[PDB]
Design an enzyme around this catalytic site. Structure first.
Site, short mmCIF file in Angstrom:
data_model
loop_
_atom_site.label_atom_id
_atom_site.label_comp_id
_atom_site.label_asym_id
_atom_site.label_seq_id
_atom_site.Cartn_x
_atom_site.Cartn_y
_atom_site.Cartn_z
N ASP A 78 0.14 -4.01 3.39
CA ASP A 78 -0.92 -4.18 4.38
C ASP A 78 -1.35 -2.85 5.00
O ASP A 78 -1.48 -1.85 4.29
CB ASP A 78 -0.41 -5.18 5.44
CG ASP A 78 -1.52 -6.02 6.09
OD1 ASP A 78 -2.39 -5.45 6.78
OD2 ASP A 78 -1.48 -7.26 5.95
N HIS B 203 -2.12 -5.54 11.54
CA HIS B 203 -1.81 -6.78 10.83
C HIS B 203 -0.46 -6.71 10.13
O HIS B 203 0.29 -7.70 10.13
CB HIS B 203 -2.91 -7.10 9.82
CG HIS B 203 -2.85 -8.50 9.32
ND1 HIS B 203 -2.25 -8.84 8.13
CD2 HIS B 203 -3.28 -9.67 9.88
CE1 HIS B 203 -2.35 -10.15 7.96
NE2 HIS B 203 -2.96 -10.68 9.00
N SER C 287 -3.71 -15.49 5.83
CA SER C 287 -3.02 -14.21 5.86
C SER C 287 -1.81 -14.22 6.80
O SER C 287 -0.97 -13.32 6.68
CB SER C 287 -4.06 -13.15 6.22
OG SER C 287 -5.04 -13.68 7.11
C1 LIG Z 1 -6.80 -8.65 11.00
O1 LIG Z 1 -7.36 -8.18 9.77
C2 LIG Z 1 -7.09 -6.78 9.71
C3 LIG Z 1 -8.25 -6.08 9.02
N1 LIG Z 1 -7.84 -5.78 7.65
C4 LIG Z 1 -8.61 -4.63 7.16
C5 LIG Z 1 -8.24 -4.21 5.76
N2 LIG Z 1 -8.04 -5.35 4.86
C6 LIG Z 1 -8.34 -5.23 3.55
C7 LIG Z 1 -8.86 -4.05 3.07
C8 LIG Z 1 -9.21 -3.93 1.75
C9 LIG Z 1 -9.01 -4.99 0.89
O2 LIG Z 1 -9.43 -4.79 -0.37
C10 LIG Z 1 -8.74 -5.17 -1.47
C11 LIG Z 1 -9.44 -5.33 -2.66
C12 LIG Z 1 -8.72 -5.70 -3.79
C13 LIG Z 1 -9.45 -5.90 -5.13
N3 LIG Z 1 -9.32 -4.70 -6.02
C14 LIG Z 1 -9.86 -5.07 -7.36
C15 LIG Z 1 -9.83 -3.91 -8.36
C16 LIG Z 1 -10.63 -2.74 -7.81
C17 LIG Z 1 -10.56 -1.54 -8.75
N4 LIG Z 1 -11.27 -1.86 -9.99
C18 LIG Z 1 -11.19 -1.04 -11.04
C19 LIG Z 1 -12.00 -1.47 -12.27
O3 LIG Z 1 -10.53 -0.01 -11.05
C20 LIG Z 1 -10.03 -2.34 -6.44
C21 LIG Z 1 -10.04 -3.53 -5.48
C22 LIG Z 1 -7.34 -5.89 -3.68
C23 LIG Z 1 -6.70 -5.71 -2.46
C24 LIG Z 1 -5.30 -5.85 -2.31
C25 LIG Z 1 -4.46 -5.54 -3.38
C26 LIG Z 1 -3.07 -5.63 -3.25
CL1 LIG Z 1 -2.05 -5.23 -4.60
C27 LIG Z 1 -2.52 -6.01 -2.04
C28 LIG Z 1 -3.35 -6.29 -0.96
CL2 LIG Z 1 -2.64 -6.75 0.54
C29 LIG Z 1 -4.73 -6.20 -1.09
N5 LIG Z 1 -7.42 -5.35 -1.39
C30 LIG Z 1 -8.50 -6.19 1.37
N6 LIG Z 1 -8.16 -6.28 2.72
C31 LIG Z 1 -7.62 -6.65 5.40
C32 LIG Z 1 -8.17 -6.91 6.77
#
Ligand SMILES: COCC[NH+]1CCN(c2ccc(Oc3cc(C[N@H+]4CC[C@H](CNC(C)=O)CC4)cc(-c4cc(Cl)cc(Cl)c4)n3)cn2)CC1
Ligand SMILES: *[C@@H]1O[C@H](CO)[C@@H](O)[C@H](O)[C@H]1NC(C)=O
Ligand SMILES: [Ca+2]
Ligand SMILES: [Ca+2]
Ligand SMILES: [Ca+2]
Ligand SMILES: [Cl-]
Ligand code: NA
Ligand code: NA
Ligand code: NA
Ligand code: NA
Length: 472
Positions: free
Chosen positions: A44, A85, A259
């Site tokens: 996270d 988080h 989450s």
């Molecule tokens: C209270 O809320 C707090 C706010 N917080 C802010 C930040 N956040 C957040 C930020 C970015 C986010 O993007 C993402 C986006 C992805 C999807 N991937 C797909 C492949 C891409 C690279 N393609 C190539 C062809 O090279 C790069 C992005 C995956 C994850 C992920 C992966 C793992 Cl292994 C563990 C976890 Cl945990 C997430 N994550 C998802 N979440 C969550 C909310």
């Protein structure tokens, strides 16, 4: 057994309930299981390692900072408290017990760490280095996020991250396999359909959805066939939420969403691994299927599958039951090696039009070392073109008559890019015999004259050929 004295433990209704609307965690504690010797890592935005309710369980060997490339996952402090988080999730798993601070973790004697990976650009390399952190020290990884929950994205792990999943389940944890626990998504209000998230849709992740305090499907929930089970989380403003550690050495009563469900599951899995450290990554999924409880979870899609278990696309097999998990783990017999039966279905490409049905009778690799009579996961790996992807709904019916929704209509998904060998996954036919007729249904749910072509349908069966129980 003496229950925790922490000041907010009474507010942890999903643990301390006396009304049967809880995760049955006290029963596991009373059997002697608290997570001692188990190591969990939160993937996270970082972890406040000096939090008064985390420091006593904090494990630097379960932690790293892949955003700034250093070992220290301390969050970046900001005026809006953006990076809180991971600290909330860490306390759900392993907040210290009986120390006069906040509440307790599910596995309050486990060791807890965090990977700071979301406070920066999330690349494939960042994902792979996080999933693959110290895989012979960390037992369980908890991840609450994935591709955007906008109801129009189809994406999953790219090559390094997928390699990290296979290395983790194959060689991780001394060959028993890393346990990856995933949240199925927060995209409910966007009508998101979570098999379009390749992380939760993976067979290598143990995927978890949410139920509200009164037993309902929360506004933020995503339905899909890849989900395996449920833990309580937040709902409407008359329903309580998750109580845990918060950034700046504080305690929150308002942690929310799917989450917040995955960390509670990770804690229950930690109790279960203490009860039997020899469980494999597949054993753990079997235990969840067998012990999870539908009772008092409300949904209109509960269906009995071919071995007599109730399954829902909102809840999987139902609410995790920690007491039942640790009890069944103790004498569990390791499952047989995983078989994989590949069946290329189509003899020609098929026009989709308004509706397409594909029927095929299979022997599930009869006569071969990958013969499967006891299914685990099944995938329909589809390659198709369509002019507006979100108008499609896709179902897969097993020989035993279990109808898995592979894709529901997604009104916001205007993409003309279709699906490129997308491996839609269902858990709903677990322990069924997959020999017989499978039916794939693809339907245009809109009145528009939409068009496209299905060019490949691979049915991929995983499972074994031994060890079945009498149906439920
Ligand atoms: C209270 O809320 C707090 C706010 N917080 C802010 C930040 N956040 C957040 C930020 C970015 C986010 O993007 C993402 C986006 C992805 C999807 N991937 C797909 C492949 C891409 C690279 N393609 C190539 C062809 O090279 C790069 C992005 C995956 C994850 C992920 C992966 C793992 Cl292994 C563990 C976890 Cl945990 C997430 N994550 C998802 N979440 C969550 C909310
Ligand atoms: C773990 O399970 C394997 C596979 O059944 C078995 O060979 C091994 O002896 C077990 N190890 C322990 C410590 O129980
Ligand atoms: Ca750092
Ligand atoms: Ca405490
Ligand atoms: Ca989603
Ligand atoms: Cl494979
Ligand atoms: Na998500
Ligand atoms: Na999964
Ligand atoms: Na049925
Ligand atoms: Na059959």
């Amino acid at each position: 057994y003496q229950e925790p004295t922490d000041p907010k433990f009474p507010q942890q209704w999903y643990l301390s309930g006396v009304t049967q609307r809880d995760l049955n965690v006290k029963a596991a504690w009373a059997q002697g299981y608290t997570g001692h010797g188990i190591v969990v890592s939160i993937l996270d935005d970082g972890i406040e390692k000096n939090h008064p309710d985390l420091a006593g369980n904090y494990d630097p060997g379960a932690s790293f900072d892949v955003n700034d490339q250093d070992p220290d996952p301390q969050p970046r402090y900001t005026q809006m408290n953006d990076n809180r988080h991971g600290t909330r999730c860490a306390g759900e798993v392993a907040a210290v017990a009986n120390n006069g601070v906040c509440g307790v973790g599910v596995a309050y004697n486990a060791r807890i760490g965090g990977v700071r990976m979301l406070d920066g650009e999330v690349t494939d390399a960042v994902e792979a280095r996080s999933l693959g952190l110290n895989p012979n020290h960390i037992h369980i990884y908890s991840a609450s996020w994935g591709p955007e929950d906008d109801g129009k994205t189809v994406d999953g792990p790219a090559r390094l991250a997928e390699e990290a999943f296979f290395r983790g389940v194959s060689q991780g944890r001394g060959g028993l396999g890393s346990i990856f626990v995933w949240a199925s998504g927060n995209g409910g209000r966007e009508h998101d359909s979570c098999n379009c998230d390749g992380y939760t849709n993976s067979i290598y992740t143990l995927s978890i959805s949410s139920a509200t305090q009164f037993g309902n499907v929360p506004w933020y929930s995503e339905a899909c066939s890849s989900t395996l089970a449920t833990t309580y989380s937040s709902g409407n403003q008359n329903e309580k939420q998750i109580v845990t550690t918060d950034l700046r050495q504080k305690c929150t009563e308002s942690h929310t969403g799917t989450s917040a469900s995955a960390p509670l599951a990770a804690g229950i899995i930690a109790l279960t691994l203490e009860a039997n450290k020899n469980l494999t990554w597949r054993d753990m999924q079997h235990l969840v299927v067998q012990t999870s409880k539908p009772a008092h979870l409300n949904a209109n899609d509960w269906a009995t599958n071919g071995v007599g278990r109730k399954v829902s696309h909102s809840y999987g097999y139902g609410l995790l039951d920690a007491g039942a998990m640790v009890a069944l783990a103790q004498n569990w017999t390791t499952v047989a090696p995983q078989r994989k039966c590949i069946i290329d279905i189509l003899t020609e490409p098929k026009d989709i039009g308004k509706r397409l049905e594909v029927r095929k009778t299979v022997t599930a690799c009869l006569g071969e070392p990958n013969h499967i009579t006891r299914l685990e996961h099944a995938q329909a790996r589809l390659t198709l073109s369509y002019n507006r992807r979100g108008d499609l709904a896709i179902h897969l019916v097993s020989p035993m008559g279990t109808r898995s929704t592979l894709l529901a209509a997604r009104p916001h998904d205007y993409s003309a890019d279709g699906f490129n060998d997308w491996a839609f996954m269902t858990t709903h036919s677990w322990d069924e015999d997959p020999s017989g007729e499978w039916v794939l249904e693809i339907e245009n749910t809109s009145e528009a004259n939409n068009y496209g072509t299905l060019t490949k349908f691979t049915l991929v069966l995983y499972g074994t050929a031994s060890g079945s129980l009498v149906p439920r």
